[model samples]
Target: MNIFEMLRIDEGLRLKIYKDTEGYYTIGIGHLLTKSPSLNAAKSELDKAIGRNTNGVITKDEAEKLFNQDVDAAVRGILRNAKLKPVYDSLDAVRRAALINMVFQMGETGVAGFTNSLRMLQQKRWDEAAVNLAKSRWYNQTPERAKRVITTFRTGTWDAYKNL
Candidate 1:
């Protein structure tokens, strides 16, 4: 089967809008309603269709379109951030991806606030960077995820990546 077919099977091809595990309003193949104009418009349409803010609906085509756009933007954001950090060039692709993921999960400004961690990374002190990340509020909020990400930072191992 095609990858799109697998994606639908994995993501669940729900035509109706529903709250995701994070309570974000999502519809049509895991598209979370965020701040984009298209997303807002679609959300409004869904709200109107359902006559409430709770659940909305969208076709498979809409889901695919939104998913593609979102993924494109996410990739671009990651790459943009990657280029801005000198330490990023020193990291392996996996570690770089991990850092990019961190920047994506936390806003650019939020990640930038990790001055100590960034410094450690710049110095190629992987363990120190891992320790600094472990000391973060983000880590406290989600220890399992933090541990996996910290492991990647500490060892530069893609296999260590988890819970993300």
Candidate 2:
């Protein structure tokens, strides 16, 4: 399939919208953003997000809970945005998910804030974007994730990436 179709958002993947609720905004996936949501609630959110994020083939809910769902929500939002799809589409699921995770921790604006990376991706300079991705300040936030994204990126396809 084409890159756009490959990176398009699907069901089972929970998205966290940073909207106001009762004068409070809680970052979470699915229904987990609800105030005081239980661990189970968070789990379901992760399950739904992962299932949908990975095109329903994988679920990482069992591996995480609570605050992690917040992180999941963050990833989901970045993935859902069309602006991120081009590069995201070029990546395998694992690298795509890693990018989402990076954006989650760093925030959407922050991810886009990478002038070099953004420009490289816009130029379809895949290798350069991949290099910028690994060398950015954000890469230090998750040393392991940086390695994974770089590996998947260098592979030149999106087959082995995972949301988990």
Candidate 3:
């Protein structure tokens, strides 16, 4: 299949908001609406889709489309906002995808908060980056997913968490 299809499976599908793998309020195939404004935006979009603002459900087709937009934004955010663009560029596909996933799960701002980790990555300290990642609340909250990302950080391969 294509990259888009692969990402769809990786992110999983959710028709409505539920406490996600990280216990965050997410819906419509991983559209995070934790903050007030984002929640309002989700409501607005749902309203447009269903002529109401209360309950919403998106089909798999719509979810796939939405994921494309979200992933695009995540990748762009990483490119535009992160200071480690050079290091990010030097990485292989899997590591690049891992960083993009970080931007998706924890916004660019949130990811930026991992100052030490980012610094390690920028310095090309793979082990340090992986250790710093493992020490964070994000890692604690989602160890399984974090392991995959950490493995990617340590090694440029996508097969670290092959079973995932």
RMSD of every candidate to native, in Å, equals 6.5, 10.6, 3.3
User: Which of the two candidates, 2 or 3, achieves a greater lDDT against the reference?
Assistant: 3
lDDT of 1 by residue, 70-148 (tens): 4455446645764336766677766775675565456567777888888888788987788888888889875765676
Choose the strongest candidate by lDDT: 3
Candidate lDDT scores, in order, read 0.63, 0.50, 0.70
| True-vs-predicted CA distance for residue 26, candidate 2, Å | 15
**Lowest lDDT 10-mer window, candidate 3?**
1-10
TM-score of 3: 0.80
Candidate 2 segments whose C-alpha is farther than 4 A from its true place: 1-68, 79-82, 89-92, 140-142, 156-164
TM-score of each prediction: 0.62, 0.44, 0.80
lDDT order of candidates, top first:
3, 1, 2
- The digit string of per-residue lDDT tens for model 2 on 52-80 reads 44322222343234335555566667667
Clashes of each: 1, 8, 0
- Model 2, global lDDT: 0.50
| Alpha-carbon shift of residue 8 in model 3 (angstroms) | 3.6
Which lDDT tens digits does candidate 3 get at residues 47-112? 565444556566676666667788888888878874646656877676777787787877888887
